[PDB]
Amino acid sequence: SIWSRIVNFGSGWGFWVSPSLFITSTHVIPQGAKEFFGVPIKQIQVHKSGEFCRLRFPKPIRTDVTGMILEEGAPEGTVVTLLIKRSTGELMPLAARMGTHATMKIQGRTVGGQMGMLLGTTPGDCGCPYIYKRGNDYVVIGVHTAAARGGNTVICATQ
Ligand SMILES: *[C@@H](CC(=O)OCC)[C@H](C[C@@H]1CCNC1=O)NC(=O)[C@@H](CC(=O)[C@@H](NC(=O)c1cc(C)on1)C(C)C)Cc1ccc(F)cc1
């Protein structure tokens, strides 16, 4: 039921990490949104770090899901799964080995990202999660923001 946590958000998608934590790409969100999922935006705790957007709701929204671990990137060489969901409803899991993780700071504020190579993606896919299993837990490392033209390179934005 992991696929049920991937919901269309604005021009792309978003992922429920826990009953109250929703992650997406910053620039797929409508610029004039005054509410999300029935909750006024004033009551939602928003944290935008570059192209990584994080929404913490004041109550459990998805009371049916379990909590996963949100971590900034994956150790280099880790292969993860980009859970792409298309407009048709078709489910397309893509494998990608993760490479160099980069971070840029300005004024106390760190934006993050990590590159990967697919082992494709299209303009409607921003916001779909990158995930891999570690032990008896599932770890989500970011949401897709970019992909090289024609090649295998992809990029997940990190917190
Ligand atoms: C997703 C964002 C979106 O809504 O699309 C239309 C604006 C989109 C996904 C890639 C486009 C083609 N295939 C994809 O997987 N991302 C973008 O449009 C972002 C920019 C790019 O992806 C370019 N690629 C790169 O910059 C790049 C660099 C490297 C090393 O690899 N790729 C082009 C392929 C367009 C920009 C964007 C826009 C809006 C967002 F919300 C996030 C990101």
Numbering used by the authors: 4 to 122, 133 to 172
Tell me, in the authors' exact words, what the paper reports.
The protease plays a crucial role in viral replication by cleaving the polyprotein into individual nonstructural proteins. HuNoV proteases are cysteine proteases structurally similar to picornavirus 3C-like proteases with a chymotrypsin-like fold. Their active site features a catalytic triad with histidine-30 (H30) as the catalytic base, cysteine-139 (C139) as the catalytic nucleophile, and glutamic acid-54 (E54) as an acidic residue which orients and stabilizes the conformation of H30 (15). The substrate binding pockets S1 to S4 in the HuNoV protease, which accommodates the P1 to P4 residues of the substrate, are in the cavity between the BII-CII loop (beta strands BII and CII, residue 102–117) and the DII, EII, and FII beta strands of the second beta-barrel.
By contrast, the GII.4-Pro HOV (2002 GII.4 variant)–rupintrivir structure reveals that the BII-CII loop, in comparison with published apo structure, undergoes extensive conformational change to accommodate the P3 and P4 residues and the bulky fluorophenylalanine at the P2 position of rupintrivir. However, in this structure, the BII-CII loop extends far past the open conformation observed in apo GI.1-Pro. Considering that part of the loop is involved in crystal packing, the observed conformational change may not entirely be in response to rupintrivir binding as the crystal packing could have also contributed. Also notable is the orientation of the P2 sidechain of rupintrivir. While remaining the same in the GII.4-Pro Sydney and GII.3-Pro structures, this sidechain adopts a different conformation in the GII.4-Pro HOV structure with a hyperextended BII-CII loop. Upon rupintrivir binding, not only does the BII-CII loop open in GII-Pros, but the R112 sidechain also extends away from the active site. The P2 sidechain of rupintrivir displaces the R112 sidechain from its relatively stable conformation in the apo protease state. Our FRET inhibition data analysis reveals that rupintrivir is almost two orders of magnitude less potent against GII-Pros than GI.1-Pro.
